[PDB]
Amino acid sequence: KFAEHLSAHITPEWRKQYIQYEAFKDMLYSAQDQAPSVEVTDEDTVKRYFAKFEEKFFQTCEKELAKINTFYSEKLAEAQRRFATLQNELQSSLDAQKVQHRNIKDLKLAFSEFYLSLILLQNYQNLNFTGFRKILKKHDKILETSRGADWRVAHVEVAPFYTCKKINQLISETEAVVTNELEDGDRQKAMKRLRVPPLGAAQPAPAWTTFRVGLFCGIFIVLNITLVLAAVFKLETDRSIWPLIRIYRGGFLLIEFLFLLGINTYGWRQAGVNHVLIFELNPRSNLSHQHLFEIAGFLGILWCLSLLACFFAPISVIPTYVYPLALYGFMVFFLINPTKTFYYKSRFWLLKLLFRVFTAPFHKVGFADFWLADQLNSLSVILMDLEYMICFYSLELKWDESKGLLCYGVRAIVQCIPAWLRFIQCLRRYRDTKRAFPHLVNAGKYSTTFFMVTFAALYSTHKERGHSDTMVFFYLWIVFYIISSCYTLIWDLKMDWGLFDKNAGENTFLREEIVYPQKAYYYCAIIEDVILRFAWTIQISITSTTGDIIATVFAPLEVFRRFVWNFFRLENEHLNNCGEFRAVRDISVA
Amino acid sequence: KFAEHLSAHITPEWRKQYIQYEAFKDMLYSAQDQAPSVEVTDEDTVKRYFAKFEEKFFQTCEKELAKINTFYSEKLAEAQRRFATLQNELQSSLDAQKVQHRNIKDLKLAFSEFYLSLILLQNYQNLNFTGFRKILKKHDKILETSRGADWRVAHVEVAPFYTCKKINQLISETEAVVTNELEDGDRQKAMKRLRVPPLGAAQPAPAWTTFRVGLFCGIFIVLNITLVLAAVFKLETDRSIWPLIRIYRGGFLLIEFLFLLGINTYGWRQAGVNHVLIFELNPRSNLSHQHLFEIAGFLGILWCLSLLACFFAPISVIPTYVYPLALYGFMVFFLINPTKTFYYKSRFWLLKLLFRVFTAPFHKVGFADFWLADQLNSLSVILMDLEYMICFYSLELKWDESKGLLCYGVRAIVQCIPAWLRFIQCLRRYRDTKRAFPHLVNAGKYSTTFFMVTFAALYSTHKERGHSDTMVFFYLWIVFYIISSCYTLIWDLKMDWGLFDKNAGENTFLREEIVYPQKAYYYCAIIEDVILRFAWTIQISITSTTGDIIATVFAPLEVFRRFVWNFFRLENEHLNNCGEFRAVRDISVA
Numbered sequence A, B: 001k002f003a004e005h006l007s008a009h010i011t012p013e014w015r016k017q018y019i020q021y022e023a024f025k026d027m028l029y030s031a032q033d034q035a036p037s038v039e040v041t042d043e044d045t046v047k048r049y050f051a052k053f054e055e056k057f058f059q060t061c062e063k064e065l066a067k068i069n070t071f072y073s074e075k076l077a078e079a080q081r082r083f084a085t086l087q088n089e090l091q092s093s094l095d096a097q098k099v100q101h102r103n104i105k106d107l108k109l110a111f112s113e114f115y116l117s118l119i120l121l122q123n124y125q126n127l128n129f130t131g132f133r134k135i136l137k138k139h140d141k142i143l144e145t146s147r148g149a150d151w152r153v154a155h156v157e158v159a160p161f162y163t164c165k166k167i168n169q170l171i172s173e174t175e176a177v178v179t180n181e182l183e184d185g186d187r188q189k190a191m192k193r194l195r196v197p198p199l200g201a202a203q204p205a206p207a208w209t210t211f212r213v214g215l216f217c218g219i220f221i222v223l224n225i226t227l228v229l230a231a232v233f234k235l236e237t238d239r240s241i242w243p244l245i246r247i248y249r250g251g252f253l254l255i256e257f258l259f260l261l262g263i264n265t266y267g268w269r270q271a272g273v274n275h276v277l278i279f280e281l282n283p284r285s286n287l288s289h290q291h292l293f294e295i296a297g298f299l300g301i302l303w304c305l306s307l308l309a310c311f312f313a314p315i316s317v318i319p320t321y322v323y324p325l326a327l328y329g330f331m332v333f334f335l336i337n338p339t340k341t342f343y344y345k346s347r348f349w350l351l352k353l354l355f356r357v358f359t360a361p362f363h364k365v366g367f368a369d370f371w372l373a374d375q376l377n378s379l380s381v382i383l384m385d386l387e388y389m390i391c392f393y394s395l396e397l398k399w400d401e402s403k404g405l406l407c408y409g410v411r412a413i414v415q416c417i418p419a420w421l422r423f424i425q426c427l428r429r430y431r432d433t434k435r436a437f438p439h440l441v442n443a444g445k446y447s448t449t450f451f452m453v454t455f456a457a458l459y460s461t462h463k464e465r466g467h468s469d470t471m472v473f474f475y476l477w478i479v480f481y482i483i484s485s486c487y488t489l490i491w492d493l494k495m496d497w498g499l500f501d502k503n504a505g506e507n508t509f510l511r512e513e514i515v516y517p518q519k520a521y522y523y524c525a526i527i528e529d530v531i532l533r534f535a536w537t538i539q540i541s542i543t544s545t546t547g548d549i550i551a552t553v554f555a556p557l558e559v560f561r562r563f564v565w566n567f568f569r570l571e572n573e574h575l576n577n578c579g580e581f582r583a584v585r586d587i588s589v590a
């Protein structure tokens, strides 16, 4: 009932302030078990044990409450100190109208993001009180006394965290001020923006969505079995399937990315590392994991069906080079669907992000656009494809005949588009912050992947012609390979993940604190990301030299290191947004 | 928020006693809209309108509360009157031990079924109070006054339904009496049987189960598309598919039965007609609709795959006459799985039911075994199959050759096994109750389906030989056809469904009350069950004369009338278990 209820309804950034139910329960249960004797020893000696612990208990309760109200009052002062500046800012603004649209618009994200601190603090008044009357009721049950219940009336509801009705009156003035100065009355349009819906792991998946995740993962399994059958029967021929996989690798890397990003969003929501505060999403509406599994499953059904139509060749009139085109025209029409349907706010946010990353020297660099520029250094085969598959229909495809599928620059550069993106983003972080370690470095990390592709291509072109200036360039590519491997594997474990810290202490080789449940995950991953970081630099070289057989088998694997890396790049982030207790974004009105 | 919360957490049998939130809200909203004028008319005249309604409101509130405590106290007295007899019964029992196992066992279903009346009445104290402070808070919000909030302290929490702390002390004595005299202490094994889990429409489907319902309905859709393809391609031949469908019709009628029974359980749970009190299930643990959709989907995957293995003929060693056998050996092994896994209590209850119906002159006739003896008068083709498919492997199958499928009594009687079952059950109802209308009649209903099969078979056998005694028997089958059609279509609308009642009133041609939301469902069904009750008597005759082409197309359709009939046979039941307010079973200890 509660221990779970409390370990779920808790605000992650504050976990070191709640009642610590588990320790209490364990203390009580251990105490009862280590009872001296039922009647074997003397009577009053049994009392001692059932006394000494009683003294210990109410003592640790005392310091326990002492934490709450101290933490509580401190948090409250913050709110008070907020409703101060957050109000005069409106005051100045109000008269100023006689960018104002913008100024008004950002202001409502100040209050809406204020009224989420309070109503996340109000919970802290209840989630403790009715987490303070439960634990006591076992103490009065286990020992079968009443001292606990009495102490509950002796200290708890006299203490300034349950009998301090200040937060509620703050809630009342914010909702009459927002109502009055933001929505021209119309309280209904104000308590639609302000209301906070039960968030965290406390929102179950809307049954229909778990169903649809069941369906699109259902059609998908049979479609995969049908592919594995038919590619071991129907396809059989003398025709080259290398165009077929060289075109159906893009969709696959992009499906294996969204299933894994779904598992990422779940492994974040459950383990407490909030992927809401960091990305700057709005904490009332999100995409829980199920929606990601569902989008991934859907695009997976589309991918499977296009492949099957290519192999089974279902209708004679449509040549065969139209199924891949239809599939990839849908996988990108779904993303620019200009209605307000099928994840409208979602795709619109993602599009704003892409536009602030695919042209990102100019715009600021948040965390969303520093993250989805390290999801493009792994799906970097979906770009050499959307180069190959675009050159191929243009200059190689035979439009005279219905049988289709069964393309000096472009590859070398297009392989380093995302590395260039991130190099520029880090230079921009520098040119604003004025701090080198860590912005100028962490811009080298990508300068190397420039001095790998270039030198590998030089060796390639000078071995194709087979000239004297070839072995020299190869000695250069091989000496820059170890560079662009270590200088990105040390950075993958020291500053991103944050592991290997002197404050490690008990956590052998790890960080001082670890958010994720077990202690073998970190070691498994610290081995994996070491293996799979050498077969991504090769994977870069080979698919740039003068190959696809190793590409289509290392591409689906790189995305796995990106998945196992998201866990820790978001942990090591949250657990730097935890030491300062920050449950709500600081929004700025200008 | 509440109107729904209240229209869901409500105890169906008591719906005519709750606060009637919707009428209140509508009254308030209409009142505010029909306000005389904002300032157009005179000031104090606006007061009149905002006064007259104020007087009206508190008046209808007054009679509203007057209903609750009167209903409440009356319900409480019942509980008190219970804890009386329900206790001395234990008292007498206690000393008697010095069938006792049985006597003890039935006694715990007396308390567990008692402590569900209280904790369904306790809710009635909260679900009203915090349904009495909401409605008022809109009245004080809409009119923007405080009279409502004051009246709340003037009448509500002085009234003997919120300040009557008697039910809770009853809960305390029942759980210390059960703890002490049923479980030898061991409070943990008593508050495992007594606890009531949030029931009704208030229990969401356990996410994993909605997922699995998504999966087994996912593999199923592609498997059906593959069947429709392959039976329009792979099967093609000169071999007779009549054995193939004459064997794969059983599984289909049994799948189309469980999907539809799932839709039945949902249409019951949602529309309020409880399928829990009537079947005598235990109200804490049930099978919500999702579990039925999931079992149906699973047996559907098995059916589809067996069919596909028959058509695709996947492995050469296993002849082809082994796939239907494997499918139907699994569909019946799933039902006698002697572990405690895969719906253990469920299948064990269903098996106890079958054993109390397939031999049912002797056992009592509850409602479960009167209901699942009218689910066997529709799945009556699954018996002429398990006759045909059993005779065929025995005396027709060619075990010498691997190619298999591509069998004077038995049919005539086996068609009337379930009609015989129900005829006997009604005779047993008579031989106990001693009442004819409705037991002796409603035993005729099945005597006719005896004088239809018999006479149709007589005409058949005398036309095969083609003798003089043929046209006479046909004039008899045709005169008993209209009998066995009208005498079961009038009974399908007058006593089962209960429709066409003189107390109809406003509900044209219907019953006085209707539990189901709309008013076109009843007419649609009253037309349907008229059409599909003539093509079930034919369907009986044809598949008994000397055919399958019309059988395999009317069998999947009869089950539809059984589905559309379950709705109303359970409505017309619940809405006779509602007039007496009975939310808990009366269990008897002997």
Ligand SMILES: O=P(O)(O)O[C@@H]1[C@@H](OP(=O)(O)O)[C@H](OP(=O)(O)OP(=O)(O)O)[C@H](OP(=O)(O)O)[C@H](OP(=O)(O)OP(=O)(O)O)[C@@H]1OP(=O)(O)O
Binding pocket: A101, A105
């Ligand atoms: O909050 P965002 O930015 O994520 O999205 C909302 C915001 O968009 P935007 O500011 O234009 O980027 C407003 O748009 P807008 O043009 O109407 O007005 P402004 O541009 O804000 O002046 C808002 O209206 P409003 O609340 O300001 O009146 C609402 O409009 P719409 O859908 O038509 O819904 P209604 O408002 O008509 O019900 C938008 O969507 P939703 O929130 O889902 O409804």
Ligand SMILES: O=P(O)(O)O[C@@H]1[C@@H](OP(=O)(O)O)[C@H](OP(=O)(O)OP(=O)(O)O)[C@H](OP(=O)(O)O)[C@H](OP(=O)(O)OP(=O)(O)O)[C@@H]1OP(=O)(O)O
Binding pocket: B105
């Ligand atoms: O209540 P039912 O009839 O629907 O089912 C229970 C009841 O069955 P039955 O009376 O035999 O028909 C008891 O069986 P039983 O033989 O143990 O004892 P009795 O025959 O009742 O004397 C009960 O144990 P118990 O609670 O009485 O000790 C429990 O057994 P089991 O798991 O071994 O129980 P635990 O060891 O986990 O308690 C059965 O299932 P569950 O309730 O799901 O567990």
Ligand SMILES: O=P(O)(O)O[C@H]1[C@@H](OP(=O)(O)O)[C@H](OP(=O)(O)OP(=O)(O)O)[C@@H](OP(=O)(O)O)[C@H](OP(=O)(O)OP(=O)(O)O)[C@@H]1OP(=O)(O)O
Binding pocket: A001, A002, A003, A004, A025, A134, A137, A141, B187, B188, B191, B192
């Ligand atoms: O009577 P029992 O022994 O069968 O059950 C206990 C009962 O409290 P009771 O006995 O009435 O005082 C539950 O509260 P309840 O629903 O009555 O609610 P109210 O308090 O009455 O509102 C309580 O949940 P909780 O809500 O306090 O957390 C539960 O804790 P459980 O979830 O198992 O474990 P935790 O998560 O608590 O550690 C207790 O079981 P045990 O832990 O074994 O003692």
Ligand SMILES: O=P(O)(O)O[C@H]1[C@@H](OP(=O)(O)O)[C@H](OP(=O)(O)OP(=O)(O)O)[C@@H](OP(=O)(O)O)[C@H](OP(=O)(O)OP(=O)(O)O)[C@@H]1OP(=O)(O)O
Binding pocket: A187, A188, A191, A192, B001, B002, B003, B004, B025, B134, B137, B138, B141
């Ligand atoms: O602030 P607003 O005006 O946007 O919203 C109102 C708000 O009460 P508030 O304003 O504080 O007085 C809700 O209660 P809440 O969460 O505050 O709960 P507390 O009681 O405060 O704990 C109330 O639900 P609820 O009162 O039935 O639980 C809701 O009615 P709606 O959902 O339609 O539910 P019904 O009308 O169908 O019942 C009201 O909206 P409108 O009906 O449009 O006026």
